[PDB]
Amino acid sequence: LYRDIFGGRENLEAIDFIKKFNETVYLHFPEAITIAEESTAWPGVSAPTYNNGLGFLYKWNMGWMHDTLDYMRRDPVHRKYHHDTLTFSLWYAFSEHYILPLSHDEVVHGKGSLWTKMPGDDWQKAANLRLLYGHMWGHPGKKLLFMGGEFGQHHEWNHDTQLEWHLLDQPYHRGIQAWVRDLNHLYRTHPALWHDGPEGFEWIDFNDRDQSVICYLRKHTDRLLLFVLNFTPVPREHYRVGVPIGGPWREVLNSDAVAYGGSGMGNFGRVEAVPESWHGRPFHLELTLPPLAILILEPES
């Protein structure tokens, strides 16, 4: 787009090439997909040419990737002080049709494995990585994950080497792979996650900075999915979260389940909603938040 009377840094040649590139593809292939990674805040990368966009269908949410990763290397003791980096991502989550992206670029050149990036001991590293993926799947936008991130590989990605598949013998790595498997199953089945527009996202609570917890909602039409995230290894008991609908609520996924390698703290399936106001909501669920865990909950149907 850029090159570094006219004095213009924008390479206008290329911008028309990109625009005529994208136009031509969809004309000859109406069902193709074009994705761009653009690390500037160039507007409307994912926008149609007739609105002066670059004409891509998808743009990498590299802002999200940076913010999320920078937030999760910090130690939970310090996460109190960087709460805004987690919450602020949504502000820019809708300017483009976006793919949340974790890629080779971030797991090379001394930047360290995704697992390596996460702080604390081995259980906490697995917990942190399980949470990162949990919030990543809950966060609006499509999903991309590079090889080896799915089991939480220790080593940086080396092209001269094959992934450390031997790590699949260790339980935590197998649990991370199962967590991702289970995440994709929920993703494929619950349409509340299909719509990454402002439609599909509602905040439940973002103001718990001391305990570093965030609650948000994902909703297409009638269906809704509740996300409660504990970003600290300290378990939370009798934590109330406001909800729109009353009645029995189901626990659809628990990051801390033993099947994923977790402590196993959870809410045992059914939680009953209390017709008492919380977070500006008519009802609320009083839940137990496991250490460094993401909880996905559904009203019962």
Partner: protein, 305 residues
């Protein structure tokens, strides 16, 4: 950080009774962390096959309260190690006081990095244990030295797993409620019966691994028998590679020369004034009650303390 800034504050107080988790050798998937208490040492290093037994390759870094910590990538379970502590001009090789497993190099002791992973089969027992309520119930204790009880052939003791089923039956046939075990903690001179201890945190190798003993308790518990351990907080073993003058100075010993001379044990009594000694001793109490679910501890020679 291996160690919290709070964990050190607990160490200064002598209020860390979970000190076992911070101290000793702790394996992770890429290596093991080593943590040793050596306050009056100028340098502390871990030496093992995992670094060619060279002091320079891995030197622990001091934190608060004379606590040393360091990570050695490639240090693995089943590896033997030793700490080389330097007190100014002089250096000495030491055993890990918090070693969870010690095995002799000769086969006639070297600290071994060990994992204490075990899944228990005595849930039902623990819920029913009487403790203080036992005063109103019968206690009939069968006292045992595992080496002396039953033999496979002359001069050959029974292993932990092996003795369980023969012993549990004999104890059950006679209707005893508990077995009191003469000290199982690692001790060099077998003829001491276990009362001069080198590995307070390590069960004796002669009868098996830490897991071998954990199962013995597992079985005895399932079969409805209690296990009481004999405990020696009154004194520590004479051999030097051990706790004697650990940091190059008096550490577990009394610093003052007048207190150190004592009847029965001299300069081998624990300095209970030191917070670190109290951490070490009280943590060991819970350690046996926690990781091995022991029902009881019997303290001998209380008058000497």
């Amino acid at each position: 950080s291996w160690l919290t800034e709070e964990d050190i504050r607990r160490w200064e107080s002598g209020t860390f009774y979970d000190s076992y988790r911070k101290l000793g050798a702790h394996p992770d998937e890429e290596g093991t962390w080593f943590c040793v208490w050596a306050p009056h040492a100028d340098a502390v290093s871990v030496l093992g096959a995992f670094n060619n037994w060279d002091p320079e390759a891995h030197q622990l870094e001091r934190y608060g309260a004379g606590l040393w910590a360091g990570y050695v990538p490639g240090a693995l379970p089943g590896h033997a190690y030793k700490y080389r502590i330097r007190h100014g001009f002089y250096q000495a090789d030491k055993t890990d006081p918090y070693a969870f497993a010690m095995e002799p190099p000769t086969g006639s002791l070297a600290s071994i990095i060990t994992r204490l992973d075990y899944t228990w089969h005595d849930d039902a027992w623990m819920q029913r244990r009487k403790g203080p309520a036992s005063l109103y119930e019968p206690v009939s204790i069968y006292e045992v030295h595992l080496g002396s009880w039953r033999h496979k052939q002359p001069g050959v003791s029974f292993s932990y797993r092996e003795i369980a089923e023969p012993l549990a039956d004999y104890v059950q046939d006679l209707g005893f409620t508990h077995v009191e075990l003469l000290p199982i903690m690692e001790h060099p001179y077998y003829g001491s019966w276990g009362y001069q201890v080198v590995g307070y945190y390590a069960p004796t190798f002669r009868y098996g691994t830490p897991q071998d003993l954990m199962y013995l308790i597992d079985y005895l518990h399932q079969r409805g028998i209690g296990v009481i351990l004999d405990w020696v907080p009154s004194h520590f073993a004479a051999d030097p590679q051990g706790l004697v003058y650990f940091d190059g100075t008096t550490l577990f010993e009394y610093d003052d020369p007048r207190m150190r001379h004592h009847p029965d044990w001299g300069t081998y009594v624990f300095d209970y004034n030191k917070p670190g000694v109290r951490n070490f001793l009280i943590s060991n109490a819970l350690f046996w009650l926690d990781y091995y679910h022991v029902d009881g501890l019997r303290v001998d020679a209380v008058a000497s303390m």
